[PDB]
Amino acid sequence: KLMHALQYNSYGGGAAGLEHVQVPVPTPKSNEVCLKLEATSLNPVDWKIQKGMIRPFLPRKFPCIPATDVAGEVVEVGSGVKNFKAGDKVVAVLSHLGGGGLAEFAVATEKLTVKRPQEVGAAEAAALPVAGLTALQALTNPAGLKLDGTGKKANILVTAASGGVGHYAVQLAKLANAHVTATCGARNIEFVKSLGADEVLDYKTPEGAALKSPSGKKYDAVVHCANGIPFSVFEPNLSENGKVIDITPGPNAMWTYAVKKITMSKKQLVPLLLIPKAENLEFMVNLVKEGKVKTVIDSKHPLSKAEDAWAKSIDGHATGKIIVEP
Amino acid sequence: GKLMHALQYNSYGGGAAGLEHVQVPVPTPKSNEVCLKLEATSLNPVDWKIQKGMIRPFLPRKFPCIPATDVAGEVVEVGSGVKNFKAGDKVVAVLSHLGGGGLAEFAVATEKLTVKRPQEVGAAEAAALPVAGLTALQALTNPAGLKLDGTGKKANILVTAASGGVGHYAVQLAKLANAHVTATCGARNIEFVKSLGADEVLDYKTPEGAALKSPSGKKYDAVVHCANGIPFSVFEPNLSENGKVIDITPGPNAMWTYAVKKITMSKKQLVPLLLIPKAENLEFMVNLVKEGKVKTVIDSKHPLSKAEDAWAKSIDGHATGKIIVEP
């Protein structure tokens, strides 16, 4: 049997290089489940890979069916799978950031598959893994926040807060009882405010460009989802041992990190390298089930027009998360 | 103001020839600092790499630059906030932020990175310790996860370029943790590395050595990788299921290769070692040396008046153990 999918065949083609195809339905390996997809979300790293940001390592092969964040129903399980059976609703992270999400079916490893409770729809779940776990990891590891009421107090800054990672980060930080400052564009100020941010800066204004807290807060940590801001801009806004947590770091961020750690600066730049874990996804899924975290969907698009979604992703102005269905 | 002898370089890329003898003011310690009359200074590869430009434009912070960070000496003046040290104390220290300072008669160290030198540990053997020894110590106790009481279950450890500064401490530290140790070096240094306690020694000029192939067919749980020019592909089939390559003195490429491997979730991992020097760890090392459980091997000693010789020896890469300038 064949399935619809989208793929690209080389670097740099953008949405135009995204091509509709029919490929074999995958067979799960022994530790895998095969999913009939119900929803897939896009992440910026998906088109960055296409652009060549992580060449030659990714993709492993052309052509590449992109996207990793999915939700669907199990239809076949590998010979070593115990926790899942045909008919289970799940959310998963597709493996090794090697795509498979823009298709009708995908295989996920059992380790990166988590049950989807009835109360959580497919789109709102598929939106979670990369963006949500990234936010979750930024705030609980380098920012060191606790999500109950244990937890040290903190001043947190979220740049590009209306985007995928940013909109989860703002919500997560308020659960950790942090004071939250956010930057975004004029159009999204009310929306970010509604996510619970205490202060919202328009990054087009001198104050916003300066990342200057209106109440004069210094930030203990920054969830930095935006681009093009030198450390020098952050530095005077940081507390004594403040950290800039760089989301989706490139080669330059990784080296700047090395030398700063080397030279022992008190104010630190921390790249966030996501390690997705089932427990954390479960945790996030449950927050969404309890309504403690809200998944905001920017737009939905059918697989037959997924190039539209891709283009929306590349253009960078999504509010929340972009969804392709399946 | 009194002057002191020092060596400095004024731009990138000059090598030993660009090293110049000068007289500069003796430093005044800030409130959290001690001023040391130096008795010894050791060189580290990162010292000439910085001069070469490996970390431009971040280092050095200014030209000219008096290089080297690993020192031992006697306190002669303390800043107004210093309590744990007084004039006359013998100490070993790491000079700050890799802004050098060590090829001089006096230097200032922060109290946080200054540790007492016990009588039984000479100045040269202590000055050799900080960067090379703490690097080794951090590689084995954090990503390798070994315990230095030896009761831990037994790892297979590989040390590449084991006759060098970091390598020679790593081999000794790994034997304290009761690991099985495989080491690579040149033909000339095989007996020396064996004497450090390595269980297996490979000549890296032989096909087996180039392949990093354990003679007894061990897979390595961790590699303290002090050598250069070895792709991950060479390590990979010698690694255990979740083995790690701990890259000593990583560059831009290592840091990015690390990111993407972690990102793609490979079970065999490349770990860059970014040294975080701490007083408690230096104390610990100094005490090991005092107890004779770790030996400092000194490659050669040179007077400050001829420190360009030491620098050249460092750049050339064939030191056995640690190179020392006095002061």
Residue numbers in the entry:
A (entry chain A): 4 to 329
B (entry chain B): 3 to 329
What does the paper say about this structure?
In crystals of apo-ceQORH, the asymmetric unit contains two monomers related by a non-crystallographic two-fold axis that form a dimer. The monomers are very similar with a value of root mean square deviation (rmsd) of 0.25 Å between monomers. The buried area in the dimer interface is 2,410 Å2. In the apo-ceQORH dimer, interactions between monomers mainly involve residues in the α-helix Pro254-Met267 belonging to the cofactor binding domain. Each α-helix in the dimer contributes for 723 Å2 to the buried area, being 60% of the overall buried area at the dimer interface. In ceQORH, the residues (Thr251-Lys269) are folded in a loop-α-helix(Pro254-Met267)-loop. This α-helix interacts with the non-crystallographic symmetry related α-helix in the apo-ceQORH dimer. The orientation of the α-helix (Pro254-Met267) prevents the monomer of ceQORH to interact with another monomer to form a dimer similar to that observed in dimeric QORs. NADPH is always present in vivo and the dimeric apo-ceQORH probably never forms in cell. The apo-ceQORH monomer was used for searching homolog and comparisons with structures from the PDB using PDBefold.
The chloroplast envelope Quinone Oxidoreductase Homolog (ceQORH; At4g13010; molecular weight 34,034 Da) from Arabidopsis thaliana is associated to the inner membrane of the chloroplast envelope where it represents 1–2% of the crude envelope proteins. Despite its original annotation as a “QOR,” ceQORH is inactive on quinones but preferentially reduces γ-ketols in the presence of NADPH. γ-ketols are long-chain reactive electrophile oxylipins and are potentially toxic. The ceQORH monomer is formed of two domains with (i) the catalytic domain including residues from Gly3 to Pro132 and from Leu277 to Pro329 and (ii) the cofactor binding domain (Val133 to Leu276) showing the classical motif of Rossmann fold. In the ceQORH structure, the internal chloroplast targeting sequence is folded as a two anti-parallel β-strands (Thr71 to Gly81 and Asp91 to Leu97) connected by a long loop (Ser82 to Gly90).
